[PDB]
Coordinates of C-alpha atoms and ligand atoms in Angstrom, one line a residue:
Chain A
X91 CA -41.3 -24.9 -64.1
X92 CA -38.9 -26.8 -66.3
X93 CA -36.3 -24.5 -68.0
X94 CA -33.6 -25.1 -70.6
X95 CA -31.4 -22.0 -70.8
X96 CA -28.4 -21.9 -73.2
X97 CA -25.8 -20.8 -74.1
X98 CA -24.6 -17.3 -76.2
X99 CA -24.3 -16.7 -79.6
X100 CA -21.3 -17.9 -80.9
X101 CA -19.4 -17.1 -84.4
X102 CA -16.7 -18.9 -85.5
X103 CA -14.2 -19.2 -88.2
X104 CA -14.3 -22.3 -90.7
X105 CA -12.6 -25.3 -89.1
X106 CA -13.1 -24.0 -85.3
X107 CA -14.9 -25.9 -83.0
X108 CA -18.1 -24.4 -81.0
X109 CA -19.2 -25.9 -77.2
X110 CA -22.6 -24.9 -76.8
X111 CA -24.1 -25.3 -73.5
X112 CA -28.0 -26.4 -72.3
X113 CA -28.2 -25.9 -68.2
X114 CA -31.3 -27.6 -67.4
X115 CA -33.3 -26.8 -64.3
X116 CA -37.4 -27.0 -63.0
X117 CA -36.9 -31.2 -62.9
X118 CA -34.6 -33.7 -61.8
X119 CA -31.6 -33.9 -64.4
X120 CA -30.6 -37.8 -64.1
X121 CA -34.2 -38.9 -65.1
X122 CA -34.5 -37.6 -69.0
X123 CA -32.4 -37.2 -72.3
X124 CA -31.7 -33.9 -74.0
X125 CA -31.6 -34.0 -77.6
X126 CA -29.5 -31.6 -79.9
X127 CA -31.3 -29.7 -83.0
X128 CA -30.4 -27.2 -85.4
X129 CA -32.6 -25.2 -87.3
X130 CA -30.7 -23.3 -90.5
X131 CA -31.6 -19.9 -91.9
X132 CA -34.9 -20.5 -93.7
X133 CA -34.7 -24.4 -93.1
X134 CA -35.9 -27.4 -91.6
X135 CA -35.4 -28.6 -88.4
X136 CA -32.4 -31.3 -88.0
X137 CA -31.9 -33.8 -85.5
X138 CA -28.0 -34.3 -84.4
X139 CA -28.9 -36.4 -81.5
X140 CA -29.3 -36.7 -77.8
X141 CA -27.8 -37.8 -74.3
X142 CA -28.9 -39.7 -71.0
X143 CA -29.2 -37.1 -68.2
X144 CA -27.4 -39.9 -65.8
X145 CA -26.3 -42.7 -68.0
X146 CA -24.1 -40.8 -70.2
X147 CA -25.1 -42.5 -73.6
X148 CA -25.0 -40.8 -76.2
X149 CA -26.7 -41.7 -79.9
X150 CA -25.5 -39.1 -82.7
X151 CA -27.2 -39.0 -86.4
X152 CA -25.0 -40.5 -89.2
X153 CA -24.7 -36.8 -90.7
X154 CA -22.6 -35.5 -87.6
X155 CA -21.0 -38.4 -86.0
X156 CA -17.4 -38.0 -86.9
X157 CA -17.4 -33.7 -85.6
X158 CA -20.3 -33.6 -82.7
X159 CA -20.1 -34.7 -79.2
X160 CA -22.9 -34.3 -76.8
X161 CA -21.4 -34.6 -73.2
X162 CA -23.0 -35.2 -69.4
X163 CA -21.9 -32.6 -65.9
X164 CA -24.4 -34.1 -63.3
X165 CA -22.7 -31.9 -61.2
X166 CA -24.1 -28.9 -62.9
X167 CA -27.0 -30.3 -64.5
X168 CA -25.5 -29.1 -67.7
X169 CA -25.4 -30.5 -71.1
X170 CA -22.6 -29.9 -73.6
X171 CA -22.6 -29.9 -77.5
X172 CA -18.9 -29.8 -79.7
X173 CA -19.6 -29.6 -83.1
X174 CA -16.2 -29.6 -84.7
X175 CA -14.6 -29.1 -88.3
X176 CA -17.7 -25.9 -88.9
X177 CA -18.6 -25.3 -92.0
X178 CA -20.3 -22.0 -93.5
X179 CA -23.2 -24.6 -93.7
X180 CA -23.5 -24.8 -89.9
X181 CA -24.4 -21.7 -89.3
X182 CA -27.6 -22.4 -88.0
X183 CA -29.8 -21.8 -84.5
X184 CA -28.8 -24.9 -81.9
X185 CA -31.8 -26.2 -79.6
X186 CA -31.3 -28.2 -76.8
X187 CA -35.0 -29.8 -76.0
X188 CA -36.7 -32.8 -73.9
X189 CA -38.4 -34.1 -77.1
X190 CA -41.4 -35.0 -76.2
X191 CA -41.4 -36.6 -73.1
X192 CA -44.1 -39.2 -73.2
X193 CA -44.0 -40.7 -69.8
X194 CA -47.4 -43.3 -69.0
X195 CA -48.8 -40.3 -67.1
X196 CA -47.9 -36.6 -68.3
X197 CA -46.5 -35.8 -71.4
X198 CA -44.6 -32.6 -71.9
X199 CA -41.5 -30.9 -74.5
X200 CA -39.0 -28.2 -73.8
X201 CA -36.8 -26.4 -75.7
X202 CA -34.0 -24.2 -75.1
X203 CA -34.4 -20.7 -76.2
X204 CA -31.9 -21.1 -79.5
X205 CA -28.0 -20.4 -79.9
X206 CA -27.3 -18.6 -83.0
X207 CA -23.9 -20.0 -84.3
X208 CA -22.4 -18.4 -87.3
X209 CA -19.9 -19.7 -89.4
X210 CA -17.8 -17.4 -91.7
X211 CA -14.9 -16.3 -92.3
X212 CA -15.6 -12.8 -92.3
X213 CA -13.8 -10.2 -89.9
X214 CA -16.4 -8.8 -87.7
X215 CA -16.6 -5.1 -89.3
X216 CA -19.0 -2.5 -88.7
X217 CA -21.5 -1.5 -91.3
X218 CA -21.5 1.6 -93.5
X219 CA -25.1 3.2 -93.6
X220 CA -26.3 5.3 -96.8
X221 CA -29.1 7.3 -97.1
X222 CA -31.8 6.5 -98.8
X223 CA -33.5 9.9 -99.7
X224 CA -36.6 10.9 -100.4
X225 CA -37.6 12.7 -103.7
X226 CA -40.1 13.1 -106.2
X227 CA -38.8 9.5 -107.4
X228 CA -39.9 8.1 -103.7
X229 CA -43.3 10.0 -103.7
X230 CA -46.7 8.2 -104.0
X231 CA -49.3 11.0 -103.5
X232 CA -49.0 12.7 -100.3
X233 CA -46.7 9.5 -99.2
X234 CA -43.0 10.0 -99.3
X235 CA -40.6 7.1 -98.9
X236 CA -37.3 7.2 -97.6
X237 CA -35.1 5.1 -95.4
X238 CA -31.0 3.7 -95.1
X239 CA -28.7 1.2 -96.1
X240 CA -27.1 -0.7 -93.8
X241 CA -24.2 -2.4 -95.9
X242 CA -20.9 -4.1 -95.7
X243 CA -21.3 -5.5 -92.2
X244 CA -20.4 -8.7 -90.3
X245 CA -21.9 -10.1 -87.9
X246 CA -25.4 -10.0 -88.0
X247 CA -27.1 -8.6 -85.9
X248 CA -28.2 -4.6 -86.8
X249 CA -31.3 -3.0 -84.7
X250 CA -32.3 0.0 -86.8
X251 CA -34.8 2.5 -85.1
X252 CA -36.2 5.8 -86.4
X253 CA -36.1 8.7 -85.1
X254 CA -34.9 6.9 -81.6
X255 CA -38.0 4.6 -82.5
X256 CA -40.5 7.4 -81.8
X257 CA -41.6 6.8 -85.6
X258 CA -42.9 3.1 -85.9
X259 CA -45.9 4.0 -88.5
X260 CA -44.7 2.0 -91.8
X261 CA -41.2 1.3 -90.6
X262 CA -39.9 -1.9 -92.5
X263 CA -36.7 -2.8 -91.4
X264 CA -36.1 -5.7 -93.8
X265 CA -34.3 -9.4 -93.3
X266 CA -30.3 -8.8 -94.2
X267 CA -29.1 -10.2 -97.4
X268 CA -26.0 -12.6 -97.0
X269 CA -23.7 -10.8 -99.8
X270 CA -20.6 -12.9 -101.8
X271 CA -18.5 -11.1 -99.9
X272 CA -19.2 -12.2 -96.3
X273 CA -20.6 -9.6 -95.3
X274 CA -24.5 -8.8 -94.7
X275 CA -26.5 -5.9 -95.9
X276 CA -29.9 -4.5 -95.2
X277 CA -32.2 -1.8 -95.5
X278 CA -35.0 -0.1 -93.7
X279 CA -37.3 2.0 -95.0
X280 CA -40.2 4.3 -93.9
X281 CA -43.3 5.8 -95.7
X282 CA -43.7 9.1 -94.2
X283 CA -46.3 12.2 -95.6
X284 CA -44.5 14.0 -98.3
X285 CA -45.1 17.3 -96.8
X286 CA -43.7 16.5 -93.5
X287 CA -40.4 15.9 -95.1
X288 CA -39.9 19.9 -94.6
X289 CA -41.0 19.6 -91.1
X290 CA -40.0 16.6 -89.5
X291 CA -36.1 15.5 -89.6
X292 CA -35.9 11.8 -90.3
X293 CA -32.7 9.9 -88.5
X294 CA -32.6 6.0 -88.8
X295 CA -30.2 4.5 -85.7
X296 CA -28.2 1.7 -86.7
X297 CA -27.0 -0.2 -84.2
X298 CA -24.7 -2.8 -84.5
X299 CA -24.0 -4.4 -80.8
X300 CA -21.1 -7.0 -82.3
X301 CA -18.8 -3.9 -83.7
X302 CA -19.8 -1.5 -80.3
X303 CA -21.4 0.6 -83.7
X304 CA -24.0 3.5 -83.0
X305 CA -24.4 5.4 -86.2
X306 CA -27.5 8.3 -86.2
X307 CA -27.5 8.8 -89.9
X308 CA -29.9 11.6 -91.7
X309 CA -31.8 11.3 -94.2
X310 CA -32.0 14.6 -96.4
X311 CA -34.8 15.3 -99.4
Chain B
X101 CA -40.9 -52.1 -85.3
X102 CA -39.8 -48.6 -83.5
X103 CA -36.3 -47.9 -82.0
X104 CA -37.0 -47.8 -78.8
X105 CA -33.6 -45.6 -78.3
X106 CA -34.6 -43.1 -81.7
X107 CA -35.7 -40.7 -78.7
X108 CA -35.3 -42.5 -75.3
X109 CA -37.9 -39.8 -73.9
X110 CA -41.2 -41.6 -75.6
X111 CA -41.8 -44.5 -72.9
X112 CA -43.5 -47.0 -74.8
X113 CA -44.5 -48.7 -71.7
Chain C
X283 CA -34.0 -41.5 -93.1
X284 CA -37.1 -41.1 -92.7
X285 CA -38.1 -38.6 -95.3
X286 CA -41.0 -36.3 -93.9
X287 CA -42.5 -34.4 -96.7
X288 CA -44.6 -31.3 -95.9
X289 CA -48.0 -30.0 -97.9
X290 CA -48.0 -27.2 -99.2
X291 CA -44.6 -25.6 -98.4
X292 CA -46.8 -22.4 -97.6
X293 CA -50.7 -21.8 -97.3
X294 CA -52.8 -18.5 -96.8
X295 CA -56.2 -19.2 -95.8
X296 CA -58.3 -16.2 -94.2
X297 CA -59.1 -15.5 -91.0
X298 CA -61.7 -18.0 -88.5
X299 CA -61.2 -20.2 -91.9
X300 CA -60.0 -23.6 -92.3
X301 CA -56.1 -24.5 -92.7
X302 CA -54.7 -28.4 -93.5
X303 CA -51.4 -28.9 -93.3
X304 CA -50.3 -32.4 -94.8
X305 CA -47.2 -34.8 -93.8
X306 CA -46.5 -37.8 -95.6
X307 CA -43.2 -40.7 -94.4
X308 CA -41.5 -42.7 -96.6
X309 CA -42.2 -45.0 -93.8
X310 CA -45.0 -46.4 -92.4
X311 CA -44.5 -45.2 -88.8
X312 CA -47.8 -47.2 -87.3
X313 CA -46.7 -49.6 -83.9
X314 CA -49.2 -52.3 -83.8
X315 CA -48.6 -53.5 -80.8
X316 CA -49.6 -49.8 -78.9
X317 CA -51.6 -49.0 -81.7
X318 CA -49.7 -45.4 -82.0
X319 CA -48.1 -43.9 -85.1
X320 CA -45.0 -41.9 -83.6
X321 CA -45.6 -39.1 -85.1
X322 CA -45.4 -34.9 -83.2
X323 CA -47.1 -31.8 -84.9
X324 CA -44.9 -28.7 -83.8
X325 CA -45.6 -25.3 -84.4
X326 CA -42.7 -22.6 -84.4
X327 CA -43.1 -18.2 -85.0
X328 CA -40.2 -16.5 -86.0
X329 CA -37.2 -16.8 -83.4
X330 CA -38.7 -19.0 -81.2
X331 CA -38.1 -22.7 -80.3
X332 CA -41.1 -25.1 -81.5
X333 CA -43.8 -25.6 -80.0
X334 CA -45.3 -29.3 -79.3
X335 CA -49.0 -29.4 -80.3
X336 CA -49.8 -32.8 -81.1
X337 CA -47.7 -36.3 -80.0
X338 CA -49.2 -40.3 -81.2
X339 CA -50.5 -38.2 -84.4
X340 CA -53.3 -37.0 -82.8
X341 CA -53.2 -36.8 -78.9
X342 CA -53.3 -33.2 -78.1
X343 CA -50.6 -31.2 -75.3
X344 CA -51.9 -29.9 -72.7
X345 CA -52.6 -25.9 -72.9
X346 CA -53.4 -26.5 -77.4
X347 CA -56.7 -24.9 -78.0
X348 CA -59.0 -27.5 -79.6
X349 CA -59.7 -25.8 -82.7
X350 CA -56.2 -27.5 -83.5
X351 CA -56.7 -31.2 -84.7
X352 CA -54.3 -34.1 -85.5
X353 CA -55.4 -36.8 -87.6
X354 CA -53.7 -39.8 -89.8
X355 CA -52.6 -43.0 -89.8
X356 CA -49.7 -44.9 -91.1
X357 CA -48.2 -42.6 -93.4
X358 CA -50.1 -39.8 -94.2
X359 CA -50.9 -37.2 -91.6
X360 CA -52.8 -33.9 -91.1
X361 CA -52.8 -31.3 -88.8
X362 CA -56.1 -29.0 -89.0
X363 CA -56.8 -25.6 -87.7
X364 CA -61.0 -25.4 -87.7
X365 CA -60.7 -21.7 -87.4
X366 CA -57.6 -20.0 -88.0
X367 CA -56.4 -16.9 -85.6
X368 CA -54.0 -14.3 -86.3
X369 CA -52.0 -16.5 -83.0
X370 CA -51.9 -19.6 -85.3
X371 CA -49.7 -17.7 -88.4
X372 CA -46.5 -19.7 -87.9
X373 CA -44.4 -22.9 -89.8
X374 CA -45.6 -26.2 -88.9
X375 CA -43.5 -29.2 -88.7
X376 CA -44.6 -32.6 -88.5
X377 CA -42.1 -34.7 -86.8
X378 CA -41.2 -38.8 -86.6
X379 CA -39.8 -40.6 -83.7
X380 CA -40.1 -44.3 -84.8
X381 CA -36.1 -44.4 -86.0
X382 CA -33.0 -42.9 -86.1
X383 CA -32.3 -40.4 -86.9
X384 CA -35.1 -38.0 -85.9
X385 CA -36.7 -36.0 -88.9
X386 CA -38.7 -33.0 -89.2
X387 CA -40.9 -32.3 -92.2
X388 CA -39.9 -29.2 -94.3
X389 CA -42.0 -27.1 -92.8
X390 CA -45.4 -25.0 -93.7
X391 CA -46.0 -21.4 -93.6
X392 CA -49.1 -20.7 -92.6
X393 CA -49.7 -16.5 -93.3
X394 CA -52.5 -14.7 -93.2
X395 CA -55.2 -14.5 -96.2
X396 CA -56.5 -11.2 -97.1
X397 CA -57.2 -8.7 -100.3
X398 CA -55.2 -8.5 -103.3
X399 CA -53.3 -5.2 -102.2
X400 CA -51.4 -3.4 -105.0
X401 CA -48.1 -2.3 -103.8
X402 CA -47.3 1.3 -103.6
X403 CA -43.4 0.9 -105.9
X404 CA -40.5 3.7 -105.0
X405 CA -36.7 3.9 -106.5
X406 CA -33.6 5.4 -104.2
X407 CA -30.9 6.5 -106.4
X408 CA -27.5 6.2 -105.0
X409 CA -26.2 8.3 -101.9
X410 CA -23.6 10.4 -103.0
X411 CA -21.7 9.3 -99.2
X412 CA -21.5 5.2 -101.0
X413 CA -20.9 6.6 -104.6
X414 CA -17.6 8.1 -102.7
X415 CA -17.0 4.8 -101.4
X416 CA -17.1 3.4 -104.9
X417 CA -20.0 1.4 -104.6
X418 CA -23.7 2.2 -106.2
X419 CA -27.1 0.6 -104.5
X420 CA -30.5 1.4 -106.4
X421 CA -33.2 0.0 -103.9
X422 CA -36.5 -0.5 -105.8
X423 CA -39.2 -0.5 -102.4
X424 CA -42.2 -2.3 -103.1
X425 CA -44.6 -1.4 -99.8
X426 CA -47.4 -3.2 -98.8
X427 CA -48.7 -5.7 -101.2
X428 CA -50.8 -8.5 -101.4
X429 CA -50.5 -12.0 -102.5
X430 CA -46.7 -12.5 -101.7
X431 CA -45.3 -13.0 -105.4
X432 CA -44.3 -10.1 -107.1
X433 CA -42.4 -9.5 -110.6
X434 CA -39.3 -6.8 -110.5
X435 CA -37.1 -6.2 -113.4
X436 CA -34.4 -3.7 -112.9
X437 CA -33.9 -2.3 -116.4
X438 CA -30.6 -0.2 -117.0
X439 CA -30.9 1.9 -120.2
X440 CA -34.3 -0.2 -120.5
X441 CA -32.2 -3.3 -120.5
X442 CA -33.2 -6.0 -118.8
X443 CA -30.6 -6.9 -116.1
X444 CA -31.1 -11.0 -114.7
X445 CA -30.0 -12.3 -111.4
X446 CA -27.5 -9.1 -110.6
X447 CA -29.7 -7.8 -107.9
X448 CA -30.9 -9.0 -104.3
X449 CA -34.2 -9.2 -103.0
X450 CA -35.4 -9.0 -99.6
X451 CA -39.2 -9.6 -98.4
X452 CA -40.6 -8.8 -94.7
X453 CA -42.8 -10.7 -92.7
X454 CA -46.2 -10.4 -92.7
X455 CA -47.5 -7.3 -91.2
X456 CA -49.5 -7.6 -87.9
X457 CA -51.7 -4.9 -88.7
X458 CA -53.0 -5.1 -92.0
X459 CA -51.2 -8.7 -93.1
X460 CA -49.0 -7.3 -96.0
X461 CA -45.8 -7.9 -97.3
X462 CA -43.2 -5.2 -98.6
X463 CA -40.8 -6.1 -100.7
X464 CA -36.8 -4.2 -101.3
X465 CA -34.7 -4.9 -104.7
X466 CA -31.0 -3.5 -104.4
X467 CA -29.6 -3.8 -107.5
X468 CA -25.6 -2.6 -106.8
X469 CA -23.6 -1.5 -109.5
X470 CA -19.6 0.2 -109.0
X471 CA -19.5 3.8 -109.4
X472 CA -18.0 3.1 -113.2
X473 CA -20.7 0.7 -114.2
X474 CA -23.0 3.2 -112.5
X475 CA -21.9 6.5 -114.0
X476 CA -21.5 4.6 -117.7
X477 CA -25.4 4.1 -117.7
X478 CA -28.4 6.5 -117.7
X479 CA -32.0 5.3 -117.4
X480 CA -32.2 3.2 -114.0
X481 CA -35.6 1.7 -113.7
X482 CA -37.7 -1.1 -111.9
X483 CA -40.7 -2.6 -113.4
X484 CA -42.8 -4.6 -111.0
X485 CA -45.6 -7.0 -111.7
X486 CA -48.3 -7.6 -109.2
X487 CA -51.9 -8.7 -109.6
X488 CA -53.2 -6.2 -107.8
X489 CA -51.9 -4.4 -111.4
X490 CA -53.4 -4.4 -114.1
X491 CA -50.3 -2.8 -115.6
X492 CA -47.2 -3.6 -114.6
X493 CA -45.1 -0.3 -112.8
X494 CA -42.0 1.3 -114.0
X495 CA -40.0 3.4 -111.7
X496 CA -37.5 5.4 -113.7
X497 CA -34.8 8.0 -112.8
X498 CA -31.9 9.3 -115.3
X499 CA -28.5 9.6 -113.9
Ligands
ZN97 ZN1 -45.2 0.4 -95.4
ZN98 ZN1 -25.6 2.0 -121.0

């Protein structure tokens, strides 16, 4: 089995520098090259280039050349990755992969599982959640919708559970907003029967790892 | 005709 | 460099039915001496790494069912699913490695095609706890609808507002292949408290009247 593990997320301040790390393993190190690619919120896949396993040599696209630097540790089988001079606009998921390897015999590809690198200049900062209550405004028949916001937080990201994720029936937690300030905001929601509203109690769980934030909010009628 | 070194992984033997 | 331009950005076809996903290069990426456009078909579902499914254009990795086919020449390219599954709903990217630097097509979504669903449309006034805080969110929910386009319009004392509120769609649901849809229109707690009628009207085609949402206050 040939496995490209990575490094951590990593979130950095505008002008920083971020070392992102590809341990390769399942193959012998010194025979292939391990390209660079980063994938942007909602966008296309970009190349930023690739090094020799054993040689060294690197090739860099035009767009990075003057900030990236993909180095070689033989010793460790490890490949490195310094983008410098980070702009809001890096923030992106960074793959390390064997694009396709096309050898006369086998052909196989491998990527590394994705590091999420943000770049903002936002303090991290725990989010404030709001309750989203349910009343005759949030009622579709015998439906009743009700749910949280999750706003004002940094980084991303939030898990939000309800009822300690015992109620998964029409739970739509949905994809954070990136607000002018910085800071993300979301919002889950959950269609529940309107009658059980005076039976059941409904608690969302926001958790937000990055801040050490665990906030059981409820949600009254 | 092809880069041979655009992705050093694709032999073109 | 090497410009790879994706068709369409996004497609719904049904299920078992047939999906074509179209690449075009600005360059002709065709070898003659091998014979072999250098050309890779990956597929890629949300937060995962891509997946190689088809390398020379149309020569298939190992482990790719075969209802997945590759086809093209020069510089226009297909990929084709004969009989699309739920495990096939991902983005495709067609990819060149003829020159530097490597490119990767746009992308195309490939969702799941089903009935029009209407969407069943809610409205969240503010929580008193954020109105404190000096801050006002009305979230407009629009749960599970089908196609993905929908029309809100906040109205605020039945005006109109335009691009003052943010919008935030799901994924397509695994069970019954919907979308839902939130629109947070955020107001401070002046701005708030110096209107009355806060409303959402949505536009679906799964109405045949568009939906107002209304609440005073
Ligand atoms: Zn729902
Ligand atoms: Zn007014």
């Amino acid at each position: 089995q040939v496995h490209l593990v990575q490094s951590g997320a990593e979130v950095k301040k505008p002008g920083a520098s971020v070392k992102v790390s590809c341990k390769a393993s399942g193959y012998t190190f010194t025979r292939y090259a391990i390209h660079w690619v980063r994938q942007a919120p909602g966008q296309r896949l970009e190349w930023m280039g690739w090094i020799k396993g054993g040689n060294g040599n690197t090739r860099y696209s035009q767009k990075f050349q003057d900030r990236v630097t993909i180095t070689r540790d033989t010793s460790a089988s490890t490949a490195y990755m310094e983008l410098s001079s980070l702009r809001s606009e890096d923030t992106a998921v960074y793959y390390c992969a064997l694009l396709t390897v096309i050898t006369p015999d086998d052909a196989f590809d491998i990527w590394g599982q994705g590091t999420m690198v943000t770049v903002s200049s936002a303090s991290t900062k725990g989010p404030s959640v709001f309750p989203l209550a349910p009343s005759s405004k949030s009622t579709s028949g015998g439906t009743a919708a009700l749910g949280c916001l999750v706003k004002d937080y940094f980084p991303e990201p939030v898990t939000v559970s309800w009822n300690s994720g015992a109620l998964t029936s029409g739970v739509h937690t949905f994809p954070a907003v990136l607000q002018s300030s910085g800071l993300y905001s979301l919002s889950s929601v959950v269609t529940v029967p309107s009658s059980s509203l005076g039976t059941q109690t409904y608690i969302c769980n926001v958790n937000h790892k990055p801040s050490n934030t665990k906030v059981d909010k409820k949600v009254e009628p | 005709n092809p880069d041979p070194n655009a992705n050093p992984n694709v032999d073109p033997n | 460099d090497i410009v790879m331009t994706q068709s369409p950005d996004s497609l719904a076809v049904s299920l078992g039915e047939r999906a074509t996903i179209n690449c075009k290069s600005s360059q002709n990426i065709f070898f003659s001496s091998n014979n072999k456009n250098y050309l890779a078909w990956y597929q890629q579902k949300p937060g995962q790494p891509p997946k190689l499914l088809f390398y020379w254009a149309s020569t298939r990795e190992s482990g790719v069912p075969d209802r997945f086919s590759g086809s093209g020449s020069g510089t226009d390219f297909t990929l084709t699913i004969s009989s699309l599954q739920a495990e096939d709903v991902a983005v495709y990217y067609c990819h060149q490695y003829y020159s530097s630097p490597l490119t990767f097509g746009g992308g195309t979504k490939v969702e799941i095609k089903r009935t029009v669903a209407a969407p069943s449309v809610f409205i969240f006034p503010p929580s008193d706890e954020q109105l404190k805080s000096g801050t006002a969110s009305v979230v407009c929910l629009l749960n599970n609808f089908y196609p993905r386009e929908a029309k809100v319009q906040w109205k605020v004392d039945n005006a109109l507002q335009s691009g003052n509120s943010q919008e935030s769609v799901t994924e397509q649901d695994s069970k019954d292949s919907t979308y839902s849809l939130s629109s947070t229109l955020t107001l401070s707690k002046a701005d708030y408290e110096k209107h009355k009628v806060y409303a959402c009207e949505v536009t679906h085609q799964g109405l045949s009247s568009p939906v107002t949402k209304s609440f005073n206050r």
